[PDB]
Amino acid sequence: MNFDKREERLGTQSVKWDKTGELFGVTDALPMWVADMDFRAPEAITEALKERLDHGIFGYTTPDQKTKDAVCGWMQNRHGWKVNPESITFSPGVVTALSMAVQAFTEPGDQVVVQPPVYTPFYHMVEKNGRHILHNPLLEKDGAYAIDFEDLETKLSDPSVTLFILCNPHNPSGRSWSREDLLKLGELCLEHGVTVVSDEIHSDLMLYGHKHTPFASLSDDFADISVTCAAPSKTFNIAGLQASAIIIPDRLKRAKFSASLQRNGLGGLNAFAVTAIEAAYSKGGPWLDELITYIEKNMNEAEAFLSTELPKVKMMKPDASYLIWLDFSAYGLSDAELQQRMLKKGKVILEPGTKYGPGGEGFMRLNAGCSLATLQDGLRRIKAALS
Amino acid sequence: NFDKREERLGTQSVKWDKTGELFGVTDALPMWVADMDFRAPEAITEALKERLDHGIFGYTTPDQKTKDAVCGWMQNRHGWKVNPESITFSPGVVTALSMAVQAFTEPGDQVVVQPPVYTPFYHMVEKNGRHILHNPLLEKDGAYAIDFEDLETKLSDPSVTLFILCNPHNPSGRSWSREDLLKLGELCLEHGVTVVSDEIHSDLMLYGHKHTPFASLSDDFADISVTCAAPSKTFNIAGLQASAIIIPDRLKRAKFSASLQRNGLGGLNAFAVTAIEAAYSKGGPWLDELITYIEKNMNEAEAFLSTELPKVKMMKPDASYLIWLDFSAYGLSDAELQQRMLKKGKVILEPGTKYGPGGEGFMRLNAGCSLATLQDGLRRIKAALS
Ligand SMILES: *Cc1c(COP(=O)(O)O)cnc(C)c1O
Ligand SMILES: *Cc1c(COP(=O)(O)O)cnc(C)c1O
C-alpha cells in the first residue's frame, strides 16, 4: 500500500475537514482532531463496495451466516478469541450499542462507573438516559495511565452501581490494559453484580506487538457478564458506513440488548455496512499489518520530535491506535487559551482534553492517522503555537 | 428499463434470501415485504460511484445542500414550503416513529392508529410502554374511509396524546383527501394531540392521485405535526437507511433531536448523505417513468382478477406498488389461505393478519417488479385457489 499518497478531503462532507468552520471558528487550520484517518479504505473493502453498487438494488439487506463467520474468523485470527456466531448482534455503531446497553442492563437512577478521562459519549449515553456517572479516575504513574483498584472497589460496591464501561484500548492515551488489570476488574464486577461493557473499537490497531486481551475471552463468568463492542470502523477508516458487531455470549443479556434495539426502531444495517464488515474482517489483514508499521513510524517521529524540540510537552506513547494524548500542563495555560494558540497561532486543530472530563485539564489529543508529511507539518504547527 | 430480468437470490435481500427462516419455504416467488425488484435510479447509482471513487469513508455529515434537495422536492412535487431548520435526518421512518413516541408521549399514554395498518406502528407504541387505541377504517365503495365519529370519541380521552397517520395508508395505498386531513387536524388541535404523519408512500401517486402533506394545510397544523419522509420507498433504497423528519415547531424538534442523541443516533451513513441529495435533486423523471410502469402493473392485475378470479375484490391503490387483495369470498381461514399461497401456488404475500383488525381475509401483493414477475404471481394466486 501507499500511505504517503496525498488525498484531498475538502468537499467530501467530511466532519474532520469540512465542518471546521461550524465547530472551531477557523477554515485555514490543519484538522488532526476527530478519530478518522486521512487514508483510503483498503482496496479489499472498496472492491466489494463497488461490487455491491454494481448489483444496483438497495432493498432491505441483512447480515447472514458468512457475515458472522468473518467476525468470528477475525477474532480467532487476530485476538485468539472464540466467538459463536450466535453471540453477535450487529449495530449501526458502537455509540448506539453503548446507549442500548445502558438502557438494557441498568434502571433509571442507577450509577455507571467509567475511568476518566475517557471518550465523551461514555458520559452522554449514561447522563442523557437518566443514569449517573460515577468516576474511577485513572492515575498517571511514570508517564502512563494505571487503574486505581482501591477507588474502583469502593465505587463498584455501592448497590446502585449496576454497570462499568471499559475502554480497552483506552481513549484517550491508547493504553492497552494488562491481563491482570482485566482479571482484577472482572472479579470485582462479579462480586459486586456489575455488568461490563467493553469498548474494544481500537483493539485491532495494536502497536509494537502489544497484545490485546478481550475481557470476555478470560473466563465463562466474564463472558456471561460482558458486552464487547467491536467494529471495522477505526481499524479500516470506515466510520462512514455505520457497521458494528456487538458480542454478548449470555443469551438473556443478548435478548435484553436486542429488545432495546427493537424498541428504538433499530436492528437493520445498511447494505454497504453488510458488505463492508464481511470484506474488512475477511481480507483486511494484510493492509492493517502495513498500517501498524506506518503508525509505529509516525509515533516514533512524534516522540523523537517533541522530546527534542518541545521538552515541556509530555507525550504518552500509545500502546495502540493512531491518537496521541499530549500533556501541555507545564505551560500553565487555561484549556481555553491552549486551544486558541493551536487554532489561531499554529493553525492546527487537536481535540481539547476537557472534552474527556476529569484528568483532561492541560491535555489535547493529536490525530497521527495521516501521512508522515502531514504529521511533520502538524508537529511544526504545535511548536509554532507555543511562542 | 423495468422489464430487465434482475437476479436478487444471493444478495442478502430480506425479500428473496430470508424466506426459509420467515415463511418455511425456499421454492416460492416472494411478493411480500415492500422493496422493489428494480435497480435504483441512475441519478443515485452515479452519485454513489463518485463517493466510492474518492475512496475515503470517514465521519460524513448532511450539509445545507442536503436539506435544499429535500426542500426542492417538497416544493416541486407537493407545493409545500419547508424551511431547512425544520429537517432532522434519521436512519429510517420506523426509527423516527420510535423517537416520536418517546419524545411526544409519557409511558401509559394512549396512541391512536387506524387499523388495519403497517405492523411497526403497534410495536413502536406497545414496546415503549404506551397503549394502542384503534380508530378502525370502514370499507365503503371497496375503498377505506375514516370513521370520524369514532375518531372524535377516542381523541377526547385525555390520556390520548398521539395520532399516527399513514398517508398514503399501508395497507391499501389509500391517499387521504384534503377534507379528510382538515377534519383530522381540527380534532387533534381541539384535543391537544400531536400528529405523526408517515408520508413514505407519498411520492408514488398513481393515476393522477395527489398527495397532501398534513403539515402543508396551515401554520396551526404544521406546528403540531411530525412529518416522516424518505426516498427509500420512492427510489428502492431502504438499504441505504436515509430519511428526512420535518418538525416545524422548534420545541418538538428539540425533543425529537434529544431522543436521537439519547439513543446514540443522529448520524447518517456516507452513502445515505449522497443518496438522499441525488434522489430528491435528480430522481424526478425516473420516478415518472416508474409511476407509469406501476399503473400498467395495476391495470394488468385488475384485468386478470376481474376475468380469472372474480371472487377477489382488489383495492386499486391510489399510491405505491402494494395491492391489498380481499379473498373473503373464498371462505378459507387466514391460515389455510397462507398455506395454499405458500405450498400450492408457491408464492409469498403479506398475510393481512399482521396488519391487525380489518385485515382478516386480506393479503398484500407486492407488484413492485417486472410485468412478467407479476403475471407469474397472479398465475400462482389462481393455482393456490384452484
Ligand atoms: C471513535 C470511537 C467510537 C465510535 O463508535 P462508532 O461506531 O463510530 O459510533 C467509539 N468508542 C471509542 C472508544 C472510539 O474511540
Ligand atoms: C416500509 C415502510 C416503512 C419503513 O421505513 P424505513 O425507512 O425502512 O424505516 C415505514 N412506514 C411505512 C408506511 C412503510 O410502508
Author numbering:
A (entry chain A): 1 to 387
B (entry chain D): 2 to 387
Give excerpts from the publication:
Once inside the cell the terminal glycine is cleaved by a dipeptidase (PepA) to release Cys-3M3SH (2), which is metabolised by a C-S β-lyase liberating volatile 3M3SH (3), which diffuses or is exported out of the cell (4). While the PatB enzymes are poorly characterised and the genes are not associated with amino acid metabolism gene clusters or operons, the orthologues from B. subtilis (PatB) and Escherichia coli (MalY) are known to have cystathionine β-lyase activity, suggesting that these enzymes might also be capable of Cys-3M3SH cleavage. ShPatB and BsPatB are homodimeric with each subunit containing a PLP moiety covalently bound to a conserved lysine residue in the catalytic site (Lys246 and Lys234 in ShPatB and BsPatB, respectively) in what is termed the internal aldimine state. In the course of a typical PLP-DE catalysed reaction, upon substrate binding, the ε-amino group of the amino acid substrate displaces the lysine residue from the PLP to form an external aldimine.
The PatB enzymes from non-axillary microbes B. subtilis (BsPatB) and Streptococcus anginosus (SaPatB) did not discriminate between the two ligands, while the enzymes from Corynebacterium jeikeium (CjAecD) and E. coli MalY (EcMalY) had higher activities against cystathionine, similar to the MetC enzymes included (ShMetC and SeMetC), which have little or no activity against Cys-3M3SH. In contrast to ShPatB, the BsPatB binding cavity is more solvent exposed and composed of charged residues, thus enabling the binding of polar substrates like cystathionine and the hydroxyl group of the 3M3SH moiety of Cys-3M3SH.
